[PDB]
Amino acid sequence: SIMSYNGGAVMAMKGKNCVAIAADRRFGIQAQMVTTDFQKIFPMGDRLYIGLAGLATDVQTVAQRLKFRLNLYELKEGRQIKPYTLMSMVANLLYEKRFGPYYTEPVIAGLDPKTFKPFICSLDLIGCPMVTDDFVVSGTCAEQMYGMCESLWEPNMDPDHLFETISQAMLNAVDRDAVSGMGVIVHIIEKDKITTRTLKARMD
Amino acid sequence: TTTLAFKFRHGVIVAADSRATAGAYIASQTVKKVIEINPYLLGTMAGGAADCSFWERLLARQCRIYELRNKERISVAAASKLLANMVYQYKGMGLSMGTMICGWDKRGPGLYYVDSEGNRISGATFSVGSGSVYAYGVMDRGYSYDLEVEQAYDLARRAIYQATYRDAYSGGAVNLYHVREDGWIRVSSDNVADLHEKYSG
Amino acid sequence: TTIMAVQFDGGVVLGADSRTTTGSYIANRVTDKLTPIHDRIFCCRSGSAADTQAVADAVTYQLGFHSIELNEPPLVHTAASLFKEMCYRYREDLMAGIIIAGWDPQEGGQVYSVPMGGMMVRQSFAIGGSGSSYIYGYVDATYREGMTKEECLQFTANALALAMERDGSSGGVIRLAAIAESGVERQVLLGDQIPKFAVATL
Amino acid sequence: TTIMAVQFDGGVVLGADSRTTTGSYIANRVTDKLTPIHDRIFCCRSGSAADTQAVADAVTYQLGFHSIELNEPPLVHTAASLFKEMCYRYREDLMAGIIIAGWDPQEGGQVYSVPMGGMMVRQSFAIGGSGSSYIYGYVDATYREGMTKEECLQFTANALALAMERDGSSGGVIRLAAIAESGVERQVLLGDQIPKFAVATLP
Amino acid sequence: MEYLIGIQGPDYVLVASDRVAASNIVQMKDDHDKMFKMSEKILLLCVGEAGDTVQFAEYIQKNVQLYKMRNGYELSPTAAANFTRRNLADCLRSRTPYHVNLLLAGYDEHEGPALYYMDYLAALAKAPFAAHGYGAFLTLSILDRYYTPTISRERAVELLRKCLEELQKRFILNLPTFSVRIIDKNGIHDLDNISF
Amino acid sequence: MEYLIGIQGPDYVLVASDRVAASNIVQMKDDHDKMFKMSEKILLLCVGEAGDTVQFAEYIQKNVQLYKMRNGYELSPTAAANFTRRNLADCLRSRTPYHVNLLLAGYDEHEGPALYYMDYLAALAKAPFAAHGYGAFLTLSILDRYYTPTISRERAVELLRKCLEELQKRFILNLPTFSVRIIDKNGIHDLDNISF
Amino acid sequence: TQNPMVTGTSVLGVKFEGGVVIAADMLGSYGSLARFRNISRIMRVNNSTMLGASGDYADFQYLKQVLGQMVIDEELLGDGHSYSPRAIHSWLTRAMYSRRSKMNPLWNTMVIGGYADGESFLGYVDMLGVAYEAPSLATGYGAYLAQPLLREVLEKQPVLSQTEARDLVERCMRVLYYRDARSYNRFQIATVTEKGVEIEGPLSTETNWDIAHMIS
Amino acid sequence: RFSPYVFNGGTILAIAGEDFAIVASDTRLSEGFSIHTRDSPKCYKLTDKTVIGCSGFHGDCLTLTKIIEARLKMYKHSNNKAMTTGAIAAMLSTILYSRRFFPYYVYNIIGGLDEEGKGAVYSFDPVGSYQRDSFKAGGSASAMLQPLLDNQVGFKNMQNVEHVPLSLDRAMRLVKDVFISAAERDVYTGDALRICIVTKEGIREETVSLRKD
Amino acid sequence: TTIAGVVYKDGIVLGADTRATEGMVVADKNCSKIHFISPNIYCCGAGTAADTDMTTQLISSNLELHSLSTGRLPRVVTANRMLKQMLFRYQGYIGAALVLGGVDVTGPHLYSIYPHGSTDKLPYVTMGSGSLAAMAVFEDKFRPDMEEEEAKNLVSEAIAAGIFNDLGSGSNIDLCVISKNKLDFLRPYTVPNKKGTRLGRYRCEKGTTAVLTEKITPLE
Numbered sequence A: 001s002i003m004s005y006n007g008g009a010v011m012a013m014k015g016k017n018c019v020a021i022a023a024d025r026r027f028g029i030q031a032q033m034v035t036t037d038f039q040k041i042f043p044m045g046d047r048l049y050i051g052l053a054g055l056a057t058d059v060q061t062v063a064q065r066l067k068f069r070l071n072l073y074e075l076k077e078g079r080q081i082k083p084y085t086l087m088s089m090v091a092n093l094l095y096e097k098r099f100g101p102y103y104t105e106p107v108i109a110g111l112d113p114k115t116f117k118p119f120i121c122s123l124d125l126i127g128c129p130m131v132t133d134d135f136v137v138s139g140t141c142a143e144q145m146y147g148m149c150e151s152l153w154e155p156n157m158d159p160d161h162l163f164e165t166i167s168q169a170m171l172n173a174v175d176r177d178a179v180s181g182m183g184v185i186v187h188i189i190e191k192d193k194i195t196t197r198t199l200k201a202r203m204d
Numbered sequence B: 001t002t003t004l005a006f007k008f009r010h011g012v013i014v015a016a017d018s019r020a021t022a023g024a025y026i027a028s029q030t031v032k033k034v035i036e037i038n039p040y041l042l043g044t045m046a047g048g049a050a051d052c053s054f055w056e057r058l059l060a061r062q063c064r065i066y067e068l069r070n071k072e073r074i075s076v077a078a079a080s081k082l083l084a085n086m087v088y089q090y091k092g093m094g095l096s097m098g099t100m101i102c103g104w105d106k107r108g109p110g111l112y113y114v115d116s117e118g119n120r121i122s123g124a125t126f127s128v129g130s131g132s133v134y135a136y137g138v139m140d141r142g143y144s145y146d147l148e149v150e151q152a153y154d155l156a157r158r159a160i161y162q163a164t165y166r167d168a169y170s171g172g173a174v175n176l177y178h179v180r181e182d183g184w185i186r187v188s189s190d191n192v193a194d195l196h197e198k199y200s201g
Numbered sequence C: 001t002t003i004m005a006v007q008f009d010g011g012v013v014l015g016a017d018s019r020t021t022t023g024s025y026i027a028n029r030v031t032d033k034l035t036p037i038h039d040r041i042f043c044c045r046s047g048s049a050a051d052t053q054a055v056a057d058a059v060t061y062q063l064g065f066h067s068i069e070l071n072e073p074p075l076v077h078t079a080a081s082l083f084k085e086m087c088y089r090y091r092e093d094l095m096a097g098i099i100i101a102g103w104d105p106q107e108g109g110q111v112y113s114v115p116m117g118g119m120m121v122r123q124s125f126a127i128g129g130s131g132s133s134y135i136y137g138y139v140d141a142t143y144r145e146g147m148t149k150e151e152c153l154q155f156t157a158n159a160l161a162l163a164m165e166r167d168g169s170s171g172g173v174i175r176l177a178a179i180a181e182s183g184v185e186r187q188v189l190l191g192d193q194i195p196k197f198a199v200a201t202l
Numbered sequence D: 001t002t003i004m005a006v007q008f009d010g011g012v013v014l015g016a017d018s019r020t021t022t023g024s025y026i027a028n029r030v031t032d033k034l035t036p037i038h039d040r041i042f043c044c045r046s047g048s049a050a051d052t053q054a055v056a057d058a059v060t061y062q063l064g065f066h067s068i069e070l071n072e073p074p075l076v077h078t079a080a081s082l083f084k085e086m087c088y089r090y091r092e093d094l095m096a097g098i099i100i101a102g103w104d105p106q107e108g109g110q111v112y113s114v115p116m117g118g119m120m121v122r123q124s125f126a127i128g129g130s131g132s133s134y135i136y137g138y139v140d141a142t143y144r145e146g147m148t149k150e151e152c153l154q155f156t157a158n159a160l161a162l163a164m165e166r167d168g169s170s171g172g173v174i175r176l177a178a179i180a181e182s183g184v185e186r187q188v189l190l191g192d193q194i195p196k197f198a199v200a201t202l203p
Numbered sequence E, F: 001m002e003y004l005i006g007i008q009g010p011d012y013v014l015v016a017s018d019r020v021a022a023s024n025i026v027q028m029k030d031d032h033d034k035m036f037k038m039s040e041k042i043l044l045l046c047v048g049e050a051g052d053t054v055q056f057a058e059y060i061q062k063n064v065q066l067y068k069m070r071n072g073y074e075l076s077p078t079a080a081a082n083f084t085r086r087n088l089a090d091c092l093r094s095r096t097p098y099h100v101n102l103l104l105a106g107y108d109e110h111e112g113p114a115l116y117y118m119d120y121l122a123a124l125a126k127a128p129f130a131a132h133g134y135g136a137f138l139t140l141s142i143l144d145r146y147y148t149p150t151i152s153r154e155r156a157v158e159l160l161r162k163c164l165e166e167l168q169k170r171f172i173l174n175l176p177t178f179s180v181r182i183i184d185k186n187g188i189h190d191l192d193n194i195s196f
Numbered sequence G: 001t002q003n004p005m006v007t008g009t010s011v012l013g014v015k016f017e018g019g020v021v022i023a024a025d026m027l028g029s030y031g032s033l034a035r036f037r038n039i040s041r042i043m044r045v046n047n048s049t050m051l052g053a054s055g056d057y058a059d060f061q062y063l064k065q066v067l068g069q070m071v072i073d074e075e076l077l078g079d080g081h082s083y084s085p086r087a088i089h090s091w092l093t094r095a096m097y098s099r100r101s102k103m104n105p106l107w108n109t110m111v112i113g114g115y116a117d118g119e120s121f122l123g124y125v126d127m128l129g130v131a132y133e134a135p136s137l138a139t140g141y142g143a144y145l146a147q148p149l150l151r152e153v154l155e156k157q158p159v160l161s162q163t164e165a166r167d168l169v170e171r172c173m174r175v176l177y178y179r180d181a182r183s184y185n186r187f188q189i190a191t192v193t194e195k196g197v198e199i200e201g202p203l204s205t206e207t208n209w210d211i212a213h214m215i216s
Numbered sequence H: 001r002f003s004p005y006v007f008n009g010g011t012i013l014a015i016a017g018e019d020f021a022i023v024a025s026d027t028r029l030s031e032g033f034s035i036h037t038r039d040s041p042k043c044y045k046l047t048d049k050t051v052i053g054c055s056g057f058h059g060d061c062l063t064l065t066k067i068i069e070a071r072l073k074m075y076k077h078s079n080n081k082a083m084t085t086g087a088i089a090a091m092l093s094t095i096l097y098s099r100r101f102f103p104y105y106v107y108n109i110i111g112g113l114d115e116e117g118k119g120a121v122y123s124f125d126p127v128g129s130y131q132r133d134s135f136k137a138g139g140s141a142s143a144m145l146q147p148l149l150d151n152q153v154g155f156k157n158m159q160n161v162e163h164v165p166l167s168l169d170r171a172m173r174l175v176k177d178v179f180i181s182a183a184e185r186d187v188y189t190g191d192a193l194r195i196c197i198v199t200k201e202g203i204r205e206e207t208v209s210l211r212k213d
Numbered sequence I: 001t002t003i004a005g006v007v008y009k010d011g012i013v014l015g016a017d018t019r020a021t022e023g024m025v026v027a028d029k030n031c032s033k034i035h036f037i038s039p040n041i042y043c044c045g046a047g048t049a050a051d052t053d054m055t056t057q058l059i060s061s062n063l064e065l066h067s068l069s070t071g072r073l074p075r076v077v078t079a080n081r082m083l084k085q086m087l088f089r090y091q092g093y094i095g096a097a098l099v100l101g102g103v104d105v106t107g108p109h110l111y112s113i114y115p116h117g118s119t120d121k122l123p124y125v126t127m128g129s130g131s132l133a134a135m136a137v138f139e140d141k142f143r144p145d146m147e148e149e150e151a152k153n154l155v156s157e158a159i160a161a162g163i164f165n166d167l168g169s170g171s172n173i174d175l176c177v178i179s180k181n182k183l184d185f186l187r188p189y190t191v192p193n194k195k196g197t198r199l200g201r202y203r204c205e206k207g208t209t210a211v212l213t214e215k216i217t218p219l220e
């Protein structure tokens, strides 16, 4: 499978007035770990991040080309992009390649730049958007992630509880997946700050 | 999987990881990949889990029958050859097994690599499994026939550990054994997460 | 599918079954496979539903424009030639077995077959689709030169009924149309109105 | 090939075309596809020439021996069952579409189909072979309960003539046989004797 | 089959590459150089399919040199690595993909030393050390075992030598000689070949 | 991948084989022996598919030894080569073919030295010199160039050394050491390994 | 069988208070050709058990032969034990699995209906030896078209009378005739109760074609 | 190309306690995009002390469980005692390996009491590799269940948490929760959850409703 | 997916389930499958999700351009032609299977539209992997000229039949009712399925997760 060549996992999760996004840190090629600090989550705004799992080369290309579009959008418009509008921008970018797609399935997490309402979504590799009110997951251990998220997530969690839940969902999910892990990074997004943590994690 | 074994002045060190996988799904972190054939003989497992466990258990049965019939411990050579001859018949049928047979007999410390392709070879050191290439690098840079016992334990432990780090299909714990003239002993079982804390560039 | 058309003196009769299938699922049990191309020119469609609808729409367009430019009713032979041109040109991308039938003031009632591959031949009567296999013998034995309109309607309904009984891909209702100078008359045979032949019990 | 058989009160009528093909070469234009299996039991053969000849010979042998042992004429149903047993057992290695028809004193005139795969079913009339596709409609519209022998002969000849006109794999002469308590009557329709229907030329 | 290795210390990057050009069962050249000088402080090391490797490496080289001529200063290692990446990725789904695996080594006046790894799919990763080829399978664990971020240049040449000795011992291919170069604040230096 | 070579002089046969056992990209043993003693004056050198090579060589060896025990004298080299051939040929269209390539070297009291070549198809040819393996491609012309039928044993060891040096220079695989033995009227003698 | 030849389509089954009813059309199809229009695809096995079969009709005939001979053999003993519907279902399960495991299946999917000791039995067996019991069953296109209707009725009312089960089967047979290109509007209904096994037919469903005039 | 296999779905779980074992399964039996029946559990009682869960191809589930049943009676007849949990597991390994070249398409988990009365779980691959576990999920939703069990029963990836023994009442809660979560996301897992609790008093059964879509 | 539509006395009722799957895993529990075309025309989508989304959005947009220009409410025939000619052009590679329903100047019209570009105009239609279950309900119970509430009952029963008998379908039933006088977009119409409630609690307190590194970045 093309999507398991590099392995990898991302997830996002919604709390009261806050969102969280997390990713493993492995860059590998089939069985071989090549590096353990590979970036998969990218800032698209002060309170808006995109996480990409899939083929590492397309993770990078889609992040970059998205950034190109977004920068042009922001310069032209008065303003910071809305979360929902970023989703659409990304949907359009992916579907342009409907017949030879990028092999990446992004998640977006953010707060509205004016209202600060929480937003999360994911898209498939051809740009079908899915907005949810709880969590989204993408990568080679999607099933593991679904199991953790379905069991742990609760409505209206504060930043501290959201952090614990996303962390435990990620760590335990990736620990059942041979080609994800080597570290987990987590960003909590609040009105007034971003908190970025790497977790203590298995390195096998 | 990563397994290794080496002969040295004080016997044979045998070490393995403990991960099993079904595709990229981790099915277990607690597999015992060192089989106790008798108190003087160990076998290691890499490849197909069912194939290794079945055929090494069958080797154990046969070594025991041998001992009852002949009134003496089977040699390392003979045990390895019994396994080789059993699997030879199945070549081409998709058995997947790479084993080290490790003991101490009247020729002293003994070590043979045996696999489902039909190889059977004696040697000083071997590593087998998807992580073997990583283990070979560390093992080879540290190996000597005149290693002290504790230096030898350190080498085996570290080599497997490094393999777990690079190889997606190796992990869990390092299980280490020492074949001495009066029998093998189980030396240690160390979780790779605890070894990471400790090590060591 | 089973499709059929028959010439009589002053016009034509067309018929079709009404079954659309994907695999052995019936996606439409009352399909209208007889499609008007101009006031007195129809096509009967068999093969691919998508291909035949697209081709019929395109020919309706071409023929309508041609007819306005000439300021006269189109020839049935012209409608057939337009079908043929498109079905021959794109024979490698289309699965379409067509019968074109109608009336015009120059040549009267006419029936043309455009089978798969895109050849075109005028016939006294034509049959097509998967079910037509089962009625070659029937129509070869029953056809008579000089049938009336009403006899052509009966002949067509009987033939289609026999085909529908045997072909898994044909069934439903029988749709008939008669075309003549005075216009087009359409009808449906359903249920008990479909001609019936006993299954042969010992 | 087109083969056919029809029950009437007191017997059966069987018919076949006479064409054997390899590819589109006619290797025999006057093949006899109606083969006697016992005194009053025939089979009509379609599919593989080699397979059907081998199977017919084997059944003839089995039925002949059975009949001597019982010291009685065989049942038509028994001949059919023997064909079925062999065509079912060896269905993966045979290409044989058979009609068994005949007369016996117990059940009279009978027609059995043993199509490819080796099922067996009794029928009022049966048709088989590649050409049979083209006459389903014809026979469904024309069959009448209670036909006489002579009507069954006419019905059979007409059906086969229609099939032979349309099917590339059927042609030649029509071979007919009538079987009844009084015996077997065989005949050939050839040339102008084959029922004729005009090709429908334009008015 | 081709071997590349890079080791990045606090103020230098050390690189090496085998010197074999092979074909079928023969070594056809034993002094082959797999390194391309892009700028005063940048080496591209390139392996992979015949024809694609030189054509790709030289295109990048000429375009890096062009940037210097147009602008009067050089691309940084990072900018050169990203330029290399964009070209490789942009060709991946084209009519002319390049089947090449690369290391890019460089020294920047302000960022210090850098080592970048790229595969043919054009995934780019910065790394403190890295290697390409089948030989990487036997040497990366030696690098994990002994590398430290403050490794001195004399010890990096020793560590390199341990890797190359491991290929002699354990690898099935005859790779008897290697090109060695270091990049630092004063540019690119040729070291002696390591031979067996 | 495995190299065998044989050189027959007036009253001896000299043979050599590589000492590598390889698997995938790694040499797993560097002192492997590809020679089997069949009798006091016969060596069988066997390469090919794993499992088949040892099973086949040892079956032959045991049967040759059995002939000696049953009969009180040994099979001649020729007779052993033909026995070997019958077995291989008889298995060729069976359920259990053996994918092996072989040299058989021997000294007979009455016929003198003999070298036989056999491939996996079981074609058997006597030859004054021969070789197997990819390495044969690079060495057979060296033997054609310099062999004579009266070559002395000292010169045959030198010629052997030229062949093995050519493998070091030109062959893509790492074959650094070779077993060398000579057979004459006094039996089988181990010479020093030729190593690099 | 590697390649089925003449085949039958869906078989339906539903349990009712005091019995079980199964239904199957009387068609043997040869590809798309409706070839044999008057064949029974239902068998009376013994007094308590009946069987319906989809798939290759020659394979069904062979099973009929084998199973019919087994009941005769058992009746010869006259010892007070008879194969229950459950036992027949078990035997069938084994026979199909065994044939599957020789890579030479009997190409059928079957519905076994019975009544024994005051309990209704309904069981399914396929060509791979997949078997189970349920209050209603439908093979082939029946699984998609009939079974949703059967289960929806059975949820509102798990216990059906005989005449309710029978009306429900007729409705399903109608839908099958509308939507399955291999069906035929000539079928049998077989019922098993305390009194034994009855097979009725040939039956037909009324049909409505009003939608032909609503091309809407 | 007749295929002798089909996937019929099913999720199995077992948990070893200090003096109990749980074996649980959903009751849905599927094929393609269809449901065969909503009432087909995947657990089978072997002895008073041992239950086996089996999912995968149902044709093989049925055959294998019948073979196991016959072999238990054979063992009892020749050895004059019931097979232990451990002996059942070792036997099953060999039965699975007998088909190494045409495998039973079955995932097996054995739950029972060992010879000291302690909970025992054995988990298998289709060709007979096995080992003893503290807990294990198998089948269609195994990848959804296992991580949660790792975390909550194994206490993995948690700091500053007391590693208490697993009570029956907490294990039950876990079991119900993980299945309810699997039924959300695995299309094959649904209808009902069947739980067997093995203790020294015998085997008792609970059933809980799950989503039907 | 199970999508369906019915023509009733005074309009159209469209229906759909809300499950989307990726493999045999539920990806969305509450997917919206009934798409806006114009104020008087809606379109249910089954098949590849990105393709149903993009195709209906494009046609809705081109139809908005059409109506802005004509000053008139669009016709259902128009949406049908546009969708079919596009899907034909793409030869079946746009995996959109659609149920298109609306009410225009000529009254109510309902079409099913297939990926290769064929369409059928019918008084009741169904699409998706649950389409046979939903069709069986329609064949069994549809009547011409149903009243509004009867037609809503029938479409929800048909969607429910897909939800419960098809593994590709699930979660909620959405309806859309379209008449000359009214548009009722009923999302959800019914919630026949629900997650069970959680028996244990896994509320992991602060410090449970060990942390290697932290960076706070304050914002405005």
Ligand SMILES: *[B]([O])([O])[C]([C][C]([C])[C])[N]C(=O)[C][N]C(=O)C1=[C]C(Cl)=[C][C]=C1Cl
Pocket (backbone or CB within 6 Å): B001, B002, B019, B020, B021, B022, B027, B031, B033, B045, B046, B047, B048, B049, B050, B052, B129, B130, B169, H125, H126, H129
């Ligand atoms: B190791 O070689 O990576 C390991 C050694 C064995 C002894 C555990 N091998 C595996 O993990 C290979 N996997 C399996 O054999 C296997 C197969 C299947 Cl079908 C299901 C589960 C497992 Cl674990």
Ligand SMILES: *[B]([O])([O])[C]([C][C]([C])[C])[N]C(=O)[C][N]C(=O)C1=[C]C(Cl)=[C][C]=C1Cl
Pocket (backbone or CB within 6 Å): C001, C002, C019, C020, C021, C022, C027, C031, C033, C045, C046, C047, C048, C049, C050, C052, C129, C130, C169, C170, I114, I116, I118
């Ligand atoms: B008839 O040739 O059997 C019939 C005639 C058409 C013109 C109505 N053909 C079919 O039913 C062939 N079916 C399809 O083209 C089809 C229909 C549907 Cl609903 C979806 C896919 C396909 Cl490929």
Ligand SMILES: *[B]([O])([O])[C]([C][C]([C])[C])[N]C(=O)[C][N]C(=O)C1=[C]C(Cl)=[C][C]=C1Cl
Pocket (backbone or CB within 6 Å): D001, D002, D019, D020, D021, D022, D027, D031, D033, D045, D046, D047, D048, D049, D050, D052, D129, D130, D169, D170
């Ligand atoms: B008929 O089915 O078209 C006819 C009936 C047989 C029984 C006479 N069959 C054929 O003609 C089929 N042809 C052959 O089997 C054949 C004939 C010859 Cl001469 C050579 C090879 C073959 Cl395969």
Ligand SMILES: *[B]([O])([O])[C]([C][C]([C])[C])[N]C(=O)[C][N]C(=O)C1=[C]C(Cl)=[C][C]=C1Cl
Pocket (backbone or CB within 6 Å): A124, A125, A128, I001, I002, I019, I020, I021, I022, I027, I028, I031, I033, I045, I046, I047, I048, I049, I050, I052, I128, I129, I168
């Ligand atoms: B239904 O047709 O089964 C449904 C309709 C859509 C509109 C929700 N289709 C699916 O659920 C099929 N899945 C997807 O299109 C899909 C594909 C991919 Cl590659 C990734 C995500 C999704 Cl959500």
Ligand SMILES: [Cl-]
Pocket (backbone or CB within 6 Å): A065, A066, A068
């Ligand atoms: Cl772009």
Ligand SMILES: [Cl-]
Pocket (backbone or CB within 6 Å): B018, B029, B030, B031, B032, B173, B175, B189
């Ligand atoms: Cl362990």
Ligand SMILES: [Cl-]
Pocket (backbone or CB within 6 Å): B062, B065, B066, B067, B069
């Ligand atoms: Cl022994």
Ligand SMILES: [Cl-]
Pocket (backbone or CB within 6 Å): B120, B121, B122, B123
């Ligand atoms: Cl050896």
Ligand SMILES: [Cl-]
Pocket (backbone or CB within 6 Å): B142, B154, B155, B158
């Ligand atoms: Cl060490």
Ligand SMILES: [Cl-]
Pocket (backbone or CB within 6 Å): C031, C032, C033, C049, C053
């Ligand atoms: Cl149409």
Ligand SMILES: [Cl-]
Pocket (backbone or CB within 6 Å): C096, C097, C098, C114, C115, C116, C128, C129
């Ligand atoms: Cl045609």
Ligand SMILES: [Cl-]
Pocket (backbone or CB within 6 Å): C046, C096, C097, C098, C114, C115, C116, C127, C128, C129
């Ligand atoms: Cl046609």
Ligand SMILES: [Cl-]
Pocket (backbone or CB within 6 Å): C018, C019, C020, C026, C028, C029, C030, C170, C171, C172, C173, G178
């Ligand atoms: Cl129909």
Ligand SMILES: [Cl-]
Pocket (backbone or CB within 6 Å): D018, D019, D020, D026, D028, D029, D030, D170, D171, D172, D173
């Ligand atoms: Cl002829």
Ligand SMILES: [Cl-]
Pocket (backbone or CB within 6 Å): D057, D060, D061, D064
């Ligand atoms: Cl005879």
Ligand SMILES: [Cl-]
Pocket (backbone or CB within 6 Å): D096, D097, D098, D114, D115, D116, D128, D129
């Ligand atoms: Cl036939």
